[PDB]
Amino acid sequence: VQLVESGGGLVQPGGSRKLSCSASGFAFSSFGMHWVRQAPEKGLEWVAYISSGSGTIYYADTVKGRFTISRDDPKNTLFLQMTSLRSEDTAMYYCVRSIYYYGSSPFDFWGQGTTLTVSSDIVMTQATSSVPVTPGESVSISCRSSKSLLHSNGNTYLYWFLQRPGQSPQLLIYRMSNLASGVPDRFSGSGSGTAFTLTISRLEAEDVGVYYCMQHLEYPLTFGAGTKLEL
Amino acid sequence: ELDQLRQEAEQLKNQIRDARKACADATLSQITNNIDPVGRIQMRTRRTLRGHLAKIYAMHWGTDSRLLVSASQDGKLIIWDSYTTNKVHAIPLRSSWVMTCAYAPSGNYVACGGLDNICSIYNLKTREGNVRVSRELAGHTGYLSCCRFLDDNQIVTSSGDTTCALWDIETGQQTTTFTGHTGDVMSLSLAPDTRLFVSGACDASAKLWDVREGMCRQTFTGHESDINAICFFPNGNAFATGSDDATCRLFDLRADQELMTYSHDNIICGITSVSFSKSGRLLLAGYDDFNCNVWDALKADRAGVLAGHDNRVSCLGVTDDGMAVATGSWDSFLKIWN
Amino acid sequence: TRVTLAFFMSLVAFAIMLGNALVILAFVVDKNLRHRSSYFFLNLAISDFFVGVISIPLYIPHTLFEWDFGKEICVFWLTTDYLLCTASVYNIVLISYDRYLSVSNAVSYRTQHTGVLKIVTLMVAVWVLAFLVNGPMILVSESWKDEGSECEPGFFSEWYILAITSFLEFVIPVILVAYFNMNIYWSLWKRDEHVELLRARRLAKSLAILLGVFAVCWAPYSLFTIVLSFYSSAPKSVWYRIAFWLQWFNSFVNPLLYPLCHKRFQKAFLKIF
Amino acid sequence: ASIAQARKLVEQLKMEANIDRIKVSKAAADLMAYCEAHAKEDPLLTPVPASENPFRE
Amino acid sequence: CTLSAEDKAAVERSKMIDRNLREDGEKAAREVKLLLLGAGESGKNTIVKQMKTTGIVETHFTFKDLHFKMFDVGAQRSERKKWIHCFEGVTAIIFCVALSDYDLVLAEDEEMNRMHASMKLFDSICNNKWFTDTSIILFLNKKDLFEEKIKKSPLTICYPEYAGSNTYEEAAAYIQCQFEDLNKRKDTKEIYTHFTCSTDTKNVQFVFDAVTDVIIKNNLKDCGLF
Ligand SMILES: CC(C)CCC[C@@H](C)[C@H]1CC[C@H]2[C@@H]3CC=C4C[C@@H](O)CC[C@]4(C)[C@H]3CC[C@]12C
Ligand SMILES: NCCc1c[nH]cn1
């Protein structure tokens, strides 16, 4: 599977730009699609979401009314039209796919992302940052939620993502404890319902990066400030 | 010659019969004549699943006892979330004529077989996000009447070829073939230890098979007509058969003899499907008179009835944790009782 | 006091209500009942239902229990009755056009895809046209009626206008229901023998009842009015009032004839019961 | 000719003759003991409270 | 509602699944399903040829904007009682009978006659408890062979008490009547008999006409008219 973004670049403030996300290798029609932006040297920020069949569309309050998300299923493409580009819209945009049914793993594959530079709610907190732990020693990254993510049905909608340097984020843990497919068993997740821990059994050269905690209890989806790991 | 072998077979059958008669010192009824009867089982339709647009021929619960798979001859294999009645998946079958379906204990795969003589294994968990046909096991010369997963790689199918087969899904070849039956094998039931399985056929005979060896160990001939359904007792040392004889029968492997006959004068229709509760105290048999009947297993009396369906109850399945019953029928609705 | 009449009239109103409500119910409950015909059966029931719920009961007092006359209610009742009734008829003509097409072009009828909107379009067009036939003229001529008058449409004075309305609400429909029903018979018989001719008898008997009940119910009144208006210019006899009630008995028997006899509705009813 | 196949049937019966059979009383006792031991585990046997019923409504 | 974001998205996915199921079902109800039956060869395969290893063979063909799915179940040398109820809702049953089999004897059983076999199969299938309403389209194949062979061998060898002249027309009509009289339900169903013309394409046309009359009568029965 792959999602390739295009359409970014240098834009004057107040201008309009269209971002395209070409999807291949998977049934694009069955996947809800998110646009998630990351500011330069900052954490991830959720931008927009359009469901399968365009039944439901949600926008971040920051960009609501200025951004329009759409999907061309016959062409297997995702579009984000941006009308009033402020100075806070400079960012790398990632096209994420998420399919929602019982036992699915949303936010599984994140596109490469495209850079867009302009000319010049539940809050997740990750207090710990720049952990200097060395490989071979277990490290636990802690995240905290203002509102209890435990739901009546029993699912705790807390997602752990890992972004290696110079690479798109990848899903590590879905719904608190569930381990994403294709992810080494070294990662484990736990949580009481408001404070969650991601424990790494062993550390390798590919485990270094920035770890983010997202909540999917309600929109807008909120990413905690990234927790950086260094050797 | 032929006559000598025929007489030898007849005398062997008589020997087995008299051995069974000698071992039948007591009946199950007189053993359980003093046990307290199960109270009137009042089960209500907790859920109703209405996606199918044709007759439902088989359903199977997932091992988590929440996901369900049901096959209908509209050409659809639907995976439901039984708690929320949501349709997790809808798989368009290559052949609309399917009379069995299975859910893998792992949950990654489902199986579907029918009049096309092919068992299609569908891979539910794919990176492409859609269910695709992982394999198409072919080689049976008759319809597939039942299929069951031993594990993610081994499957057991029963056909109208008067034979059962154990397939290695990865290679797509029949690892073993069981050829003891003389009639269309209409049902299948893997033992809880997954080392034995009982197959009932249209010759009114149910045979116990060892998957590892490939040889029949015991045969049971207590019925009068086709054995449409079969199910193992939870402990694995007994099983129950439903037949067009309008009776259910409980056969014990160790005793190699039937223990109880669940039959009523007011009942004259066949049994499409049978199942046991988790404790094994209740035998739930889906009859053709549109009503599923819940029998006490230890005592022949009928505990209750499930009268939700307006057509023949084709499939019946109890959750692994025993929380619910799922009855499918030819009226295109599956109904989750509790 | 003859309040026994009120018992009867309320009872028949109830019958219209229950009968048609059951047809409305089965439609909602069963999702099998979503054929082009089934939507049309709903429309028939909706129109008729309100004869029992809106029209008939308001009439009870005016006719029997003194009066409850309102310069507004009078118009409302008049416009509603002459809409619900003319819509019931138009639905019969629609059900019959559906059946004509079933038999006449059975390939196309089967293979055609009819979006709920196309069906809802036609269902609504029945109501629109129904209103147009009598409603504008009831509203417009509400004034001509002046005072010291029974609650009758104002255009009753002009036989010619009355005739136009009955042409569009009885003559045109009865010609068409009969054409359609006839082609339904002609077809079977001409496939275009004891058992064949026996079955053809049953088709024609049943198609005849359907045309018969339409006319034997609806006509007495449509004819009574024109003749009285043209000749006598009137004040209502026992008969006129029997003919008034005949045209409502058509709304009671409609659910019995059209939807109840449909096999698919019968299946649905049996489940509910 | 085909009688050899029928001869194989005979051999199968021989195997079923070698199966050791316990008394039916013991089998019935074991079935009853299993059914009594897991009586509390079965939710269908005894209707569980609606609080812990997954299909509450 | 109390549903979380993922639960609401799952419910939306289930609604989309239901819409797809409804569309596929309404598309499938617009196709004519014909159950194809015959005894041995019986020209059945040829009938499949006219209109275009194990298990059911499904032939999908369109004609005059009507889609036919014909299910040849000949290969299922299994117990028919255990799977014949799967076709309870077929529009019609195309039953092929070889006329030339009147004198031929069954290869499987020398005593048994092929024609009387098809007669037994027809009696079992027209009076079946599942096919009370479905109409049977009888296809009497190989009329040329039968016409050439009736001169050499009289029909009386197969049918006792046949007082015909052994001409093609009289013998063919007698065989058609003998097959059509096995129908013990002459009111609920009808039997449309046709002598297969191998040369012309009239076979699919006859199937189309019979199916249109079945559809018309089904509509009239559902409406309750007759
Ligand atoms: C009084 C007239 C002028 C206007 C009102 C017409 C009303 C009573 C009729 C006309 C069209 C009808 C609707 C046509 C289509 C549908 C969609 C169906 O899924 C439910 C019934 C429903 C909603 C019908 C309800 C009754 C209806 C709304
Ligand atoms: N169809 C006109 C309204 C009416 C007449 N009689 C009873 N109701």
Numbering used by the authors:
A (entry chain E): 2 to 121, 125 to 235
B (entry chain C): 3 to 340
C (entry chain A): 14 to 205, 291 to 332, 335 to 373
D (entry chain D): 7 to 63
E (entry chain B): 3 to 54, 181 to 354
Paper text:
H4R preferentially couples to Gi in the immune system, blood vessels, nerves, and enterocytes, and is involved in the expression and release of chemokines and cytokines. H4R could also signal to Gq with a slightly lower efficacy (pEC50/Gq = 6.8 vs. pEC50/Gi = 7.1).
Our cryo-EM structure of H4R-histamine-Gi was determined at 2.9 Å resolution, with unambiguous modeling of H4R, histamine, and Gi proteins. The Nπ atom formed a conserved salt bridge with D943.32 and was further stabilized by W3487.43 with π-π packing, enhancing the binding of the imidazole ring of histamine. The ethylamine moiety of histamine exhibited extensive HBs and polar interactions in the sub-pocket surrounded by Y953.33, C983.36, E1825.46, W3166.48, and Q3477.42, among which, Q3477.42 served as a bridge mediating the interaction between histamine and the conserved toggle switch. The water-mediated HB between the histamine and E1825.46 was observed in our structure. In the α5 helix interface, S3046.36, K3638.48, and R2045.68 of H4R formed HBs with L353, D350, and D341 of α5 helix, respectively. In the ICL2 interface of our structure, Q12534.56 and H12634.57 of ICL2 formed HBs with R32 and E28 of the Gi αN helix, respectively. Upon activation, the H4R-histamine-Gi complex adopted a typical active conformation, including the outward movement of the intracellular end of TM6 and the inward movement of the intracellular tilt of TM7.
